[PDB]
Design a protein around this nucleic acid. Structure first.
Ligand code: MG
Ligand code: MG
Ligand code: MG
Ligand code: MG
Ligand code: MG
Ligand code: MG
Length: 327
DNA sequence: CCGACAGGCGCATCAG
DNA sequence: CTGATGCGCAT
DNA sequence: GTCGG
């Protein structure tokens, strides 16, 4: 498919190994950073030296690229692919709620297959049990046509609960993607600000309404501001059912919507890059605020923010529309 | 060369 | 029980 | 694994 697709596939597979098997989060991030910068690079890479000029690509990745270019493979990966333990741990982490730690522990206890998981429900926590239940469905992508039907349901049902709610579909959907891995919904209500919560159960009431109409089907986790769960579009007579889909809802302080929507629009790599750039500039950005850093690494008071662009301006970045925050 | 690497919610668990 | 910590997850 | 001080 893609211009340096071989290289970026290699690097992403190395990232996953470092995260899932090595449990080295900074090496995972370093590989993902390199994969992203190479994926955006508009030339077919001819050497590692050429790749090394990109920020995030260093000596070790440049050497892997030289290997890959010459031979069409990487020995280091060819050996990870035949390592039984690595391969089993990597597979189990595909279940939502099983991470590197739980996968290694399962693999040590003799559980390394889907079949093994499916006769050991009792060793799984609630999240894992649901991740297993919908293992196949959760790896299917959601065409934009279906994302549009799902937006319509969520926005109309939210409006039924209280007309003052605003629900914004974020993630890859807001970035214009033709398909999405899941549905991300940012929610606000005027009664929840950074200064005051003057209504309880604001997130709960929306979740309950979506359960009532059979859109939300399962709950992975749920607190006062974050819901993680499962939903499904209604199917019509004699049609196969739609796959079950992952849904995330985040209730954000209304007056902090712009930091909220910046966060929830991503991409994840974009947010890391942006937040890392903020730190270089003497600021810290989360889903609520952008704050200056003081001398001794302590965060100051929130800066006024009136648009997404305001946050970009503070770190002296030219604005990027959501569609230009992908990959 | 070597600190630092994005930020935080919800859940599960440990020490007391 | 609270407070701390790690895990898995979200972008 | 990479990079800025
Ligand atoms: Mg470089
Ligand atoms: Mg997993
Ligand atoms: Mg998403
Ligand atoms: Mg994602
Ligand atoms: Mg999501
Ligand atoms: Mg059904």
């Amino acid at each position: 498919e893609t211009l340096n697709g071989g290289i970026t596939d290699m690097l992403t597979e190395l990232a996953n190994f470092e995260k899932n098997v090595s449990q080295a989060i900074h090496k995972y991030n370093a590989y993902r950073k390199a994969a992203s910068v190479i994926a955006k690079y508009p030339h077919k890479i001819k050497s590692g030296a050429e790749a090394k000029k990109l920020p995030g690509v260093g000596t070790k990745i440049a050497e892997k690229i030289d290997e890959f270019l010459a031979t069409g493979k990487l020995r280091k990966l060819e050996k990870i692919r035949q390592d039984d333990t690595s391969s089993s741990i990597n597979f189990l982490t595909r279940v939502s709620g099983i991470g590197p730690s739980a996968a290694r522990k399962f693999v040590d206890e003799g559980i390394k297959t889907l079949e093994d998981l499916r006769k050991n429900e009792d060793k799984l926590n609630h999240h894992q049990r649901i991740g297993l239940k919908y293992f196949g469905d959760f790896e299917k992508r959601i065409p934009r046509e279906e994302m549009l039907q799902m937006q319509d349901i969520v926005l109309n049902e939210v409006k039924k609960v209280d007309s003052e709610y605003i629900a914004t579909v974020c993630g890859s959907f807001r970035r214009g993607a033709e398909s999405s891995g899941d549905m991300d919904v940012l929610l606000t209500h005027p009664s929840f600000t950074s200064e005051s919560t003057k209504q309880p159960k604001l997130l709960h009431q929306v979740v309950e309404q979506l359960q009532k109409v059979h859109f939300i089907t399962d709950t992975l986790s749920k607190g006062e501001t974050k819901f993680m769960g499962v939903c499904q579009l209604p199917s019509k007579n004699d049609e196969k059912e739609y796959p079950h889909r992952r849904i995330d809802i985040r209730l954000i302080p209304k007056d902090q919507y712009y930091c909220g929507v910046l966060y929830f629009t991503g991409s994840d790599i974009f947010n890391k890059n942006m937040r890392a750039h903020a730190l270089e500039k003497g600021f810290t950005i989360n889903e609520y605020t952008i704050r200056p850093l003081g001398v001794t690494g302590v965060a100051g008071e929130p800066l006024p923010v009136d648009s997404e662009k305001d946050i970009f301006d503070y770190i002296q970045w030219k604005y990027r529309e959501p569609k230009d925050r992908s990959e």
